[PDB]
Write a protein that binds this ligand. Structure first.
Ligand SMILES: [Hg+2]
Ligand SMILES: [Hg+2]
Ligand SMILES: [Hg+2]
Ligand SMILES: [K+]
Ligand SMILES: [K+]
Ligand SMILES: [K+]
Ligand SMILES: [K+]
Ligand SMILES: [K+]
Ligand code: NA
Ligand code: NA
Lengths: 49, 51, 51, 49
């Protein structure tokens, strides 16, 4: 139960990393998106005043 | 082998818990992020067209 | 049982810990994504005042 | 085996906290990112508008 029942830590890390990397990537994507839906749009309201 | 059949249930039950919070966070961020677009395109239609 | 109580222990002890991180992450996302309208609805009014 | 194998929670809490603190730093990073861009862009428009 020592050299075998360590999967509860390891197998969960495989899960928690996948959810973390999907969270980390999605936050980065959506935040970069809003930054490209701001600096792209503010340059248009500035290009007309 | 109650050992193997138990550690698989722990990984499973926690997977269902861990997957639940990810989806809750995923939908929350996606909902909030799209809401921030609803408050960004609302100014482009207002301050560019009509001012 | 004896192994069902140690399986329910680590599952429960982690379930609230994940709920600790999840609800905390939920608070961070909500807080800041609630500020971005405080930094828009209060910021749009300045562009509406001068133009 | 004795009674408790709390290293399961321990060495997993090492993972949950590490991924959380990473996601904690990520959200705090982007929320500060869009904050400067909320200020720099707003102050940029206030010149000619
Ligand atoms: Hg065990
Ligand atoms: Hg929407
Ligand atoms: Hg910045
Ligand atoms: K990138
Ligand atoms: K669904
Ligand atoms: K609606
Ligand atoms: K044991
Ligand atoms: K800052
Ligand atoms: Na804690
Ligand atoms: Na905490």
């Amino acid at each position: 139960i020592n050299e075998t029942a360590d999967d509860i830590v390891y197998r969960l890390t495989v899960i928690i990393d996948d959810r973390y990397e999907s969270l980390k990537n999605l936050i980065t994507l959506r935040a970069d998106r809003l930054e490209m839906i701001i600096n792209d749009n503010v340059s248009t309201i500035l290009a007309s005043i």
